[PDB]
Design a protein around this ligand. Structure first.
Ligand SMILES: *C/C=C1/C(=C/c2[nH]c(/C=C3[NH+]=C(/C=C4/NC(=O)C(C=C)=C4C)C(C)=C\3CCC(=O)O)c(CCC(=O)O)c2C)NC(=O)[C@H]1C
Ligand SMILES: *C/C=C1/C(=C/c2[nH]c(/C=C3[NH+]=C(/C=C4/NC(=O)C(C=C)=C4C)C(C)=C\3CCC(=O)O)c(CCC(=O)O)c2C)NC(=O)[C@H]1C
Lengths: 482, 485
């Protein structure tokens, strides 16, 4: 299939900005209808419907639901929709030719979009177990454990989305015969922003098969709209061939994703993976969604504990810090307890510039390196830095990324010989793991993507730094007087 | 007749300090065994064993479980208890002489206390709770679906104010039955030991009201004093005071899900049922999970609530700045040109702007000559803020406006001719409107005297908002101080 292969290549030419909200195709495990709500007249119908219902989608276009779905059920659908907002609709189940379809209704472009998903013919204790978790890591462990336990899926993962966008596999429950994924990082380019919008606006994305031929959805433009059909809010969609082949080369044939949402933001993704195709029942579909609606609230509540404790120990930090500031230069005294400065931000590497021998601690490059690094701090004038990239401001400084890649540095406003640099290395060294569209390849792409880019600094973490400079800006006048 | 009444009257005198952490008795719907940790020798046994099992309870002390629980089941619970810390324990169902007991194990004072209790929609429920947009709507759906699953007639949710009093914020009453929405009862209605036991655990269950507690024998702890710690035990005697309280209501079965915002008792979901009924283990955990989930939502959504107020408060202060700047005669009198905006800045009902003998009042406040003394009494201390939960408690002659002006907060710059931006609040007696010995009416009536002259509490943000205006008033006057040119 040479003619198919090169035609697939042109798809890979552009993927960051590709129309995926309006593919014009749906997965073959259901039916799709686009109607005018008051009369329930068909505007769009997929080509899958030929294999289950009347002849051709074009003839059904422009007609009423009373023909395709028969009588009685049409009036039932009209009664259920009525004038309701279509929020928290009860469970519906239809049977047009002995096949049971779950009917999910929503409204797009003032049109009734109805998805007939084909369906083939404990919880409190687990919530208590989630509540019993004392830290975030144990929470992740128990959540993935029970999800893999009851979902029945061979592989269950969870990614957390950093502010930079490169997802991190923070936990897993992999069964034997799949590779481990703890600490794996994949670039944000692996998920287009349109797919991110689709994930955030929904709560559950299911792809039961990654080896399928998308079915046409004709007419591609609505007769009364002359524009593409919004399929964002439909479970029955078309999977892009690029991520389809990604799944094929990832070993995953059936996948799920529970979009963990915190305050309108996509905190992460409870993902799955299964070589044998599996069709998920709605009862378990809601339970997994109920996990995300609870766990994301539980996670945000638990980091709300963590962000309080970390901020709390930051508050105490300057309390014991300032006692040694008052004991005896101001930036000279902080070097006698280097581990106390580490916990203020989580630097994993610190150094204090003083006189000539810049007394570094933890891990740190040679003095010939840090000396030619802090010069790009005080010329700008900013007392603090949020430097994921080491060499964004200092181009030829790529020789420090072995140890020094994230520079949130402070100093006294003294123009000469001051500073206490908190080096966070590249995330590449922190996590050790292990053709085209491979998890191995995206790891390699991430290595170039992460090259020189370090771990993100929290706003409070920079604030907690600013207090240390402010605390050092308190007793200096007392030090000057004394 | 009089003999029973004689005992109760002595009990009613010392309810505020009564030992309910060590009742010495258990409810008749199960058994309790306190054992030595390594050998499982019966250290304490309830008197109900002569009925549940038939063996005398006076004896059997200091002997292994083999007499009652056999050897195989004793070994099973030995394996379950040992090296587990009892953090997460699966369901243990035992069958002694054809009777099924659900086993709950814990440890108090280094002894194994074992309690033998005689024996799809969750996803939609969680989705419905998460879909709530407002706190009142959240309460309504919570109580309505709790009444939908649990067969208990009345379902209420009390939100405990920081003062200590409980109010029924939402209620799902059965048709043709008493209505308690908007009710208030005092803090003394629930003792501090009871509140500690509520916050320590998650559920309190009283299957039957008119019940005779069955005591423990031997009563005194064989090891040390302080008796048996029945604080983490689901099976525990109910004090006759609250017992007759429930009996008067007509409700004989009572559920109670302790809503905990971390380590604080935010409130209680109470299911009152007029007919005795059971709970079942599956429903017991589902109700507990609802309280754990709902308290997560309240804690999360309350943060949404205050942030909305914080955004509204911050925006108003900059909004008031534009109004304040346009004034040409008096900064605070100019602030009175938009009084309805001033009311909602801090949260209040009456607002008074005080000029020289001209109290530019707006809303519900006394006539100027009465709160004049309150304005001068502020000058007695010169406090930047005067957040007062109770007015008559601090200001003696507060009865002249105790009905309407009880919760007072104000602020003013130090000036020769002082002003006021007093933010009154009516006593919550006026806000509440609801229809002999232990009744909600007398509880409401005893609450009315208890909460006489006390309005709702001022939050930290409310007190903070007054300072921001005072900073703005200082800053606006600071610009006014230079604009004499
Ligand atoms: C610019 C185009 C690209 C792309 C397209 C694409 N990706 C997704 C969604 C992905 N891709 C994931 C990639 C992974 N990274 C890993 O480390 C692993 C496995 C260990 C995988 C699979 C990924 C996790 C997602 C989210 C799915 C989930 O369930 O978590 C989409 C959206 C597909 C859809 O139809 O929803 C598209 C179109 N693939 C590329 O390789 C880049 C170039
Ligand atoms: C000083 C002692 C007293 C006391 C003791 C007591 N009360 C409780 C628990 C109660 N009592 C409640 C009473 C109500 N007040 C109302 O307004 C209504 C109804 C509208 C009721 C029922 C009440 C709500 C609780 C908390 C129950 C819950 O929902 O969690 C106890 C604890 C008993 C136990 O075993 O749990 C005690 C000891 N009652 C008094 O009236 C005063 C004198």
């Amino acid at each position: 299939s040479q003619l198919d292969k090169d035609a697939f290549e042109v798809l890979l030419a552009n993927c960051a900005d590709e129309p995926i909200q309006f593919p014009g195709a749906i997965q073959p495990h259901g039916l799709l209808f686009t109607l005018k709500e008051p009369e329930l007249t068909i505007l769009q119908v997929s080509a899958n419907v030929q294999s289950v219902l009347g002849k051709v989608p074009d003839q059904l276009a422009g007609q009423t639901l009373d023909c395709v779905l028969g009588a009685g059920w049409a009036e039932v659908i009209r009664s259920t929709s009525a004038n309701d907002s279509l929020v928290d609709v009860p469970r519906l189940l239809m049977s047009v030719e002995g096949v049971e379809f779950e009917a999910l209704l929503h409204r797009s472009q003032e049109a009734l979009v109805l998805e007939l998903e084909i369906q083939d013919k404990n919880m409190g204790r687990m919530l208590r177990q989630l509540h019993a978790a004392a830290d975030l890591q144990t929470l992740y462990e128990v959540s993935v454990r029970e999800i893999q336990r009851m979902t029945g899926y061979d592989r269950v993962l969870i990614y957390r989305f950093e502010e930079e966008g490169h997802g991190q596999v923070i936990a897993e429950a992999s069964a034997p015969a799949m590779e481990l994924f703890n600490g794996l990082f994949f670039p944000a380019s692996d998920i287009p922003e349109q797919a991110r919008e689709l994930y955030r606006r929904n709560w559950l994305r299911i792809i039961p098969d990654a080896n399928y031929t998308p079915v046409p959805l004709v007419p591609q433009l609505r007769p009364d709209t002359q524009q593409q059909l919004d399929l964002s809010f439909s479970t029955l969609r078309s999977v892009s061939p690029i991520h389809c082949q990604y799944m094929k080369n990832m070993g995953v044939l059936s996948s799920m994703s529970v979009s963990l949402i915190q305050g309108g933001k996509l905190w992460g993704l409870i993902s799955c993976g299964h070589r044998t195709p599996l069709y998920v029942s709605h009862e378990l579909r809601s339970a997994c969604q109920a996990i995300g609606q609870v766990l994301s609230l539980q996670i945000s509540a638990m980091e709300a504990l963590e962000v309080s404790r970390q901020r709390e120990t930051k508050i105490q930090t300057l309390q014991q810090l300032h006692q040694m500031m008052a004991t005896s230069d101001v930036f000279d005294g902080l070097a006698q307890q280097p581990q106390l400065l580490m916990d203020l931000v989580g630097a994993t590497g610190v150094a204090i510039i003083e006189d000539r021998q810049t007394h570094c601690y933890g891990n740190c490059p040679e003095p010939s390196d840090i000396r030619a690094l802090h010069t790009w701090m005080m010329a700008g004038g900013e007392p603090v830095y949020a430097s994921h990239h080491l060499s964004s401001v200092y181009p030829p400084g790529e020789a420090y990324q072995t140890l020094a890649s994230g520079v949130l540095a402070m100093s006294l406003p003294k123009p000469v010989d001051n500073g206490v640099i908190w080096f966070r290395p590249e995330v590449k060294q922190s996590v050790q793991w292990s053709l085209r569209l491979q998890p191995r390849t995206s790891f390699e792409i991430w290595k170039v993507e992460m090259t020189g880019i370090a771990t993100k600094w929290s706003h409070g973490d920079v604030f907690a730094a600013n207090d240390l400079r402010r605390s050092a800006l308190e007793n200096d006048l007392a030090r000057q007087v004394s």
